[PDB]
Design a protein around this ligand. Structure first.
Ligand SMILES: Nc1ncnc2c1ncn2[C@@H]1O[C@H](COP(=O)(O)OP(=O)(O)OP(=O)(O)O)[C@@H](O)[C@H]1O
Ligand SMILES: N#CCc1n[nH]c2cc(Cl)c(Br)cc12
Length: 327
């Protein structure tokens, strides 16, 4: 069967913490007062929650309330425990309260409000300096949660909020995050299509923090090359084909050979044979202002099939691409 894998960093952080840290089902939720929050307007709804802008009437501060749908309310202790474990960490969204919604009769998570800059505006306006600055800020959040024994598993632009005026970044939506335990087989149905790592796409379950580093690479490639998304799959199968057209099929087959993976036979008729393309293939007049040799080298070290080969968040922070960023 498949060859096992473990992370190369923060491998046993969970074994060395009291069980209460990661045994989220044993956690006793401390409930706040729902009357402290007045709903103002609905911001959105997904298959898992409804999100509202609200006011905390005890301090007249804006907050965001995420009301869990009856379906997603089951794994709520995992999201709660992760948010409480990470609270106060670098660029981690703050969970302000947990209340029982009077209408849905489900848990409602109350978060720090971010006056975030529009995501399309961020995509279209961030300069070369800004991309480096904000990539360094998201790396601080990722290294912190990985060092705390947690994988986010849903890194994408909409989950990395930026309030551009205050040069403030927050990593949000921890509903898919999980505790990393060496040897654990995880569900591959995580992350959003364009940000799924090859490990998910080839159905390799023994993945780790390094999944988040692939997703971060996908964000970086889209930003510097002005291509949204960078790997534009029609579905989860075509997603792997899109990747293979850039990274090549030989390194893909070496990856599945190494891990002794049984690749879905549906790929035999669609992967084809592709060589790796040099990153300069994607440079053009409209993105050259965002591209540098250091950006290409950094990207090259994130977007690797072999999850064990990718830079860790702490190694990424050491890269020359960040030397120009004021620290
Ligand atoms: N802490 C927060 N501060 C301010 N706005 C927030 C906060 N958390 C979430 N939001 C916003 O709430 C809105 C609704 O949330 P939701 O997750 O449904 O949307 P989304 O991010 O556009 O979804 P998707 O994951 O499909 O891209 C979004 O505009 C999101 O940016
Ligand atoms: N794509 C896109 C826009 C965008 N949304 N959120 C971001 C976070 C960072 Cl770190 C960077 Br760089 C860019 C974005």
């Amino acid at each position: 069967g498949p060859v096992p894998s473990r992370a190369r960093v923060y491998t046993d952080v969970n074994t060395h913490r009291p069980s209460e840290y990661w045994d989220y089902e044993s956690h006793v939720v401390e409930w706040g007062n729902q009357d402290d929050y007045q709903l103002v307007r609905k911001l959105g709804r997904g298959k898992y929650s409804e999100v509202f802008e609200a006011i905390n009437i005890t301090n007249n501060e804006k907050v965001v309330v995420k009301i869990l749908k009856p379906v997603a309310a089951a794994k709520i202790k995992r999201e709660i425990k992760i948010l409480e474990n990470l609270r106060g960490g670098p660029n981690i969204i703050t969970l302000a309260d947990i209340v029982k919604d009077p209408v849905s009769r489900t848990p409602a998570l109350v978060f720090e409000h971010v006056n975030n800059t529009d995501f399309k505006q961020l995509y279209q306006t961030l300069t070369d300096y800004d991309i480096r600055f904000y990539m360094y800020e998201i790396l601080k959040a990722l290294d912190y949660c990985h060092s705390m024994g947690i994988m986010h598993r849903d890194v994408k632009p909409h989950n990395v909020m930026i309030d551009h005026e205050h040069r403030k970044l927050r990593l949000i939506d921890w509903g898919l995050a999980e505790f990393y335990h060496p040897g654990q087989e995880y569900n591959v149905r995580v992350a959003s299509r364009y940000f799924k790592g090859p490990e998910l796409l080839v159905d390799y379950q023994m993945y780790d923090y390094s999944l988040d580093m692939w997703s971060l690479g996908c964000m970086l490639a889209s930003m510097i090359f002005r291509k949204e998304p960078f790997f534009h799959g029609h579905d989860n199968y075509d997603q792997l084909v899109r990747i293979a057209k850039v990274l090549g099929t030989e390194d893909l087959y070496d990856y599945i050979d190494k891990y002794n993976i049984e690749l879905d036979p549906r790929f035999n008729d669609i992967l084809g044979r592709h060589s790796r393309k040099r990153w300069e293939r994607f440079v053009h007049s409209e993105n050259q202002h965002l591209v540098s040799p250091e950006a290409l080298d950094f990207l090259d070290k994130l977007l690797r099939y072999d999850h064990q080969s990718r830079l860790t968040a702490r190694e990424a922070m050491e890269h020359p691409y960040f030397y120009t960023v004021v620290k």
